[PDB]
Symmetry: C3
Subunit: 399 residues, 3 copies
């Protein structure tokens, strides 16, 4: 679709071509982050700090459960009730309906309250009544079992209490850091698996492993941050927040590719100029449009986004990319650093009056006219060239 010859004459060079992927059809698994740990090994010396920690956990989980109930009541009443909400965007109403649909798994999790409380190690997998599986997180119990139980004989009782109080304070701080935006807005906020794992020593590989997935396998999903987490249920007395973590599938957009453009400085009457274009241009069947690659993720061979994220292009840029190059944006190179050459289709295009161009077959400098912008380098005249510092071999123009 792009007019590559005119763009090369203006100094715009075809780059890599990527596939394009969108989140779709997510699969979900359950996870319970227990805020009040099981401390049966050190229960005697932690009496004062544990009650304070329980009160602090209750004071931060009560508004969360109140906000969850204020959302469930709206749906349970009727179908979201457009009167009870008053105002919201489409995403909020969709999230509320999804939360009501997930209330069944919330009740299934709440059925396992005693088994959740009786977990006595860092990560445990429990068989749910619906034949599902959920992961229990007991980060403090890992700290206890690793740092206090092996040395329980040496430490005095007051020292144990102080150390466990510091550990509980640290875990509360980490929860407030990661789950902070979620506890203030439970129905809308989604937390990535890395941010969720930040309360578990940033060990997201262990979280993925216990839920059935090897971290090296899902890297196209994990890298783009598509493994989200959403609050499903909060119990203020048992002290846990349970999450439903998505593992979305990626669908190939039909007949859509993402094209990379590499800019090259070109000379006009001795002066260096760079043409200003988006570095990524999305090509559909009959349309050409921008793509905000910052909010997406660029992999080795594909571009992954959670939504379509396609944006229209100005008529000037459309004309620039379709062959009317007089309308392209361009700026003077007062800097000393710009790419003076690039390699595409086995041919190196270089700006030979602003950088040196030499042949190795005969050590003579090739001349490019002041009446042309970028010179084509290929096997028709010379076989291996030196541009700037580097010297590379080159294919043929006939290809």
């Amino acid at each position: 679709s792009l007019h590559y010859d005119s763009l090369s004459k203006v100094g715009i060079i075809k780059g890599l071509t990527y596939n394009y992927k969108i989140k779709g059809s997510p699969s979900t698994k359950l996870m319970v982050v227990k805020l009040i740990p099981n401390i049966d090994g050190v229960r005697n010396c932690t009496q004062k700090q544990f009650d304070e920690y329980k009160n602090l956990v209750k004071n931060v989980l009560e508004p969360v459960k109140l906000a969850l109930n204020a959302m469930l009541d709206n749906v349970k009443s009727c179908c979201m009730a457009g009167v009870a909400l008053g105002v919201a965007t489409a995403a909020t109403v969709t999230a509320g309906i999804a939360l009501h649909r997930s209330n069944e798994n919330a009740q299934a999790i709440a059925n396992m309250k005693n088994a959740i409380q009786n977990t006595n190690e860092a990560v445990k997998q429990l068989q749910l009544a619906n034949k599902q599986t959920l992961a229990v997180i007991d980060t403090i119990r890992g700290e206890i079992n690793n740092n206090i139980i092996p040395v329980i004989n040496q430490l005095s009782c007051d020292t144990i209490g102080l150390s466990v109080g510091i550990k509980l304070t640290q875990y509360y701080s980490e929860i407030l850091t990661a789950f902070g935006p979620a506890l203030q807005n439970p129905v809308n906020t989604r937390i990535t698996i890395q941010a969720i794992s930040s309360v578990f020593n940033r060990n997201f590989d262990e979280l993925l492993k216990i839920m059935g997935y090897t971290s090296g396998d899902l890297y196209e999903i994990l890298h783009s941050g598509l493994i989200r987490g959403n609050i499903i249920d909060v119990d203020v007395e048992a002290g846990y927040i349970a999450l439903e973590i998505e593992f979305p599938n990626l669908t190939l957009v039909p007949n859509a590719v993402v094209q990379e453009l590499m800019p090259i400085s070109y000379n006009v009457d001795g002066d260096e100029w760079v043409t200003l274009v988006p570095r990524f241009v999305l090509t559909r069947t009959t349309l050409l449009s921008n793509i905000d690659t910052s909010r997406c993720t660029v992999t080795e061979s594909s571009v992954i986004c959670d939504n379509d994220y396609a944006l229209p292009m100005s008529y000037e840029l459309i004309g620039c990319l379709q062959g009317d190059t007089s309308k392209c944006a361009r700026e003077k190179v007062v800097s000393s650093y710009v790419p003076r050459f690039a390699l595409s289709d086995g041919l190196v295009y270089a700006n030979c009056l602003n950088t040196i161009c030499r042949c190795m077959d005969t050590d003579t400098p090739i001349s490019q006219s002041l009446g042309t912008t970028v010179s084509l380098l290929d096997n028709k005249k010379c076989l291996v060239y030196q541009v700037g510092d580097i010297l590379i071999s080159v294919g043929s123009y006939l290809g």
Copy 2:
């Protein structure tokens, strides 16, 4: 202020309304972060590493004290002398004046040098001579008391020295990570309580607790990053930096609200279009202006900023919001992901030709004319509507 009817006809929907808050009248408390810890218990095996760490701390703290002794004497000379400072912005001169005003607390801290040095646990509160209270941070001493002292019988002397050297290097690295911008510009740089706590295992709840504030009650200040810290005094021989932490009060701006606008796709002759506006618009008594919500923090009911940040609005955009909708910024949709419906004051506004609309109330579809942009759904015709995937009940227009 806003003309909601014309905006709805253009596809702009009234959202949530927030209060507006600004930092004002801060209260201050003192903390002493000690770089050179008390090392009693392992002093014999750490002789080589401790002296090297002391020299490194001296080398990193001497330029800080040199700069502090500058701005202070600049005031002590006279009032900030304009001849000695040569060039400075208003914030720098105000910060220097505040530093001189806090030099009294700096001297009070320096009076407690022996007690600060003799602290032998992670966090200790000392009664100052002015009846003030300050918090001592001894992060390495906590690491020692938790990891070396309980197993002091098993470790050989060389292993203790190597491990404590690694711990000292780790803490010095964390100090350079957090206080790095501060130690090269002490009078201007302000460090948030989370970034300060990053040298204390990211445990800011412990820092707030020892200084008298519960983290769960202080969230409206803590979340927006208004709990800052400023260098007040550095002692190169005792090896500590003393910080003064602000706990500002939030003032309600008189008769000022922040209005959220949510965009909705609207159709003209079959094509999807989205109107571009700021998502947050600030409304004063008789003025309308933008607000940089990126710098601010949006809570569940209010917007919190350290400065008012009331940027002005373009004349075209002002005309667009006040009723002249012909001048609004308008953009074609070339993406599958655009919000097609929104819910406000019990009514739902939807694009029924670019997404499906039906009446679950009477099992009939909902056609809107091609001559209108956005259709109004209310209880005049059907009681329950289905828009897209999701179906919602709806209030009445007469309200």
Copy 3:
């Protein structure tokens, strides 16, 4: 270059003058991040988890070695080969050539495979065959020696296995977090020393120390993120990734300075206005150009950038800074927070119709006409002044 008098009359104040530095002529040193640790003290109880971790490391390192071998074969087949690569930018070709040039050090590292495997502490320095020195990282072995060996008698065999499995999973997660963008693109991706140290408990001072540089002396390079790392060799069976770290020298750009400008509100007919200009303006011998200070680093006396980054300047802004102030961009103030005064050349410039201005010598209000924008305060009339809340002494304009 800049016309400071007209800018002051428009409300633009001369600021600090900084030097300007660019990366150049880097020195390189080697390190080896060992992915598969030596755990011989706990080998019996960790047999199940260690074999799984070995397979995970192999699965995560095989594509990296394949990608490195592809780039090496594109060069050993000659000087890069334009036909084999097909398409790439200049940076990629330069990086591939540098990788082939560093293949000699890669082979030298691979010569020391048994010595690398047999190391048994966190950091060890090995004498390479080329008289070079390299640093080995064994982060898991540090965790073992600090947390498992001292309490090896108390822990049961199953508990040791579970704990070391959790530790190995944690290290794998940390490696995927830091080296993630590198393992998916080895030839191009460069990693800062802090990000590399994030797999070693964020202890970059220890990494710099073993390789021969004190962190305090190297802060000028370290702060700007110029200490990069590049993948040099991967061994999928021995389980390590070898990195080459650049310690670049900083070159003073000849006769180039970076100028800072304070914006100052000025009044025309009662209304506050702010002139919109870049906060940093670069001045060469005969040119004036913008500088992207966001990508650069501003120190106390100099600006450090990895590239020139001298962007061109608009004609209107050039005319504004060169004396044609009618073309300056100006903005109405509808905000309560604007800097109203600035100090430069010992002379304070203030907008006295929007803030109070007094002398303390006569204690009488300072009056500026509505027909002038900003007023000059100097020793010709009063010796000490008060502007707003703060009162400052001032120098003499007559000098």
